Amino acid sequence: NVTGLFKDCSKVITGLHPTQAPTHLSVDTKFKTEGLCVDIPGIPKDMTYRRLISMMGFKMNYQVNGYPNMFITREEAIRHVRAWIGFDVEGCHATREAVGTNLPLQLGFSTGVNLVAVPTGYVDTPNNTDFSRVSAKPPPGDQFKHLIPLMYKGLPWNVVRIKIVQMLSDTLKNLSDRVVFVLWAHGFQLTSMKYFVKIGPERTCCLCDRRATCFSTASDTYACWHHSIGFDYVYNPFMIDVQQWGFTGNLQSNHDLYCQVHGNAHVASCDAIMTRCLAVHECFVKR
Amino acid sequence: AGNATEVPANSTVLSFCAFAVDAAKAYKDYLASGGQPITNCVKMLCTHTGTGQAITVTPEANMDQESFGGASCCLYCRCHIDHPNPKGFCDLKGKYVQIPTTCANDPVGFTLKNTVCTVCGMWKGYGCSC
Ligand SMILES: [Cl-]
Ligand SMILES: [Zn+2]
Ligand SMILES: [Zn+2]
Ligand SMILES: [Zn+2]
Ligand SMILES: [Zn+2]
């Protein structure tokens, strides 16, 4: 019937004018009749709203000629084990002016790096969707209250994504021509990738013959891991969801069956480290 | 909590275009690879006695057109991504858009692929006689 993708998380009780509503569902009920919508002169468009739109629920299950896979097979992942980067994200929850979606708070990688982002969301307005800071709270529970100080120590996303590209480039330039993000579950990781990933046809670096791994919005150019200084987007990453390989139970319990040297520090980078670690064991341990 | 705006039939196309560097090319290519057009647009009940102009403050479909809410036919509005206009203005949001009935199965693709004549106000190739 409905999806939560692009759910309106505002607390406004009325709906949208027919000229401003992105969809039939979002039109205010006053305008709906006979399965259609009507224009009502004298009930004009609204010029002041700010409606947080949820980015939870991406579905990357397309087949478009000339565009590569994002999610890859296990066999392809195995071939590209040098490109594996575990990735996990801790989130915070929208509050106050909006409620009902989660924003990336701490992004962690199997390099051991954690980056903290300002709570940021996609806000529909009478004009362009506004990418902006939003009010946020920790997820409910005593075990999350340690996230509270992080909600005041974050970096703006424009800095965060440059740092992600720099980190991946420094890590991978002498290892691989690509990145494979190794995930445990994928929904919130994919939500977080909306903030720092772009996709399209396979491209080549503007400075050499390698495939492009990075994109620059400022210059509209493409670079490989060697030539990406200043670039802000990861371009055509690959990824695989380890949780889908038949496991029951949570990440730590499955990781700990194989490995005793990654004690759980309860932080995104540690989840990312355990995810890549579990993936290596599951794919390569001979049985 | 919150109020859904979308239906699952649109999840794949909107996700693909929401990540694309070039969203317009991505939608065009998605359709060319057999993807279903974006649905759940704001279709208007109207008289079909309108002027036939492309983009209007009231529905203006004639007998060979359907009228839609403007934002709902705009790929950038539907994906909640940046608009081509550097000032962040949409050509369609806040207006109604007329779509030839033969193309009304894919209003988003129609507006993406076509151009309004600013002189006569009709779609080039679908009304503009300049
Ligand atoms: Cl490829
Ligand atoms: Zn290069
Ligand atoms: Zn381990
Ligand atoms: Zn628009
Ligand atoms: Zn004309």
Numbering used by the authors:
A (entry chain A): 3 to 289
B (entry chain M): 1 to 130
The authors write:
An ExoN variant with a nuclease-inactivating mutation (E191Q) was used in our crystallographic studies, as it was expressed more robustly and generated a more stable complex with nsp10 than wild-type ExoN. We obtained crystals under two different conditions, one containing ammonium tartrate and the other containing magnesium chloride (MgCl2), albeit in the same crystal form. The structures were determined by molecular replacement phasing and refined to 1.64- and 2.10-Å resolution for the tartrate and magnesium-bound crystals, respectively. While our structures of SARS-CoV-2 ExoN–nsp10 obtained in the two different crystallization conditions are highly similar, they show notable differences in the exonuclease active site located around the “knuckles” of ExoN. In contrast, the higher-resolution tartrate-bound structure shows a unique configuration of the metal-free active site. Without the magnesium ion, Asp90 takes two distinct conformers with its carboxylate group in orthogonal orientations. Glu92 is pointed away from Asp90/Asp273 and hydrogen bonded to Gln108 side chain, whereas His268, in turn, is flipped away from Glu92. These observations demonstrate high flexibility of the ExoN active site in the absence of divalent metal cofactors. Notably, we observed ordered tartrate ions from the crystallization condition bound to this basic patch in our crystal structure, potentially mimicking RNA backbone phosphate interactions.
SARS-CoV-2 nonstructural protein 14 (nsp14) exoribonuclease (ExoN) plays important roles in the proofreading during viral RNA synthesis and the evasion of host immune responses. To mitigate the low fidelity of RdRp, all coronaviruses encode a 3′-to-5′ exoribonuclease (ExoN) in multifunctional nsp14 (10–12), which forms a complex with nsp10 critical for the ExoN activity, and additionally contains a C-terminal guanine N7 methyl transferase (N7-MTase) domain. The multifunctional SARS-CoV-2 nsp14 consists of the N-terminal ExoN domain involved in proofreading and the C-terminal N7-MTase domain that functions in mRNA capping. Collectively, these results show that the N-terminal ExoN domain of SARS-CoV-2 nsp14 is sufficient for binding to nsp10 to form an active exonuclease complex that preferentially degrades dsRNA.
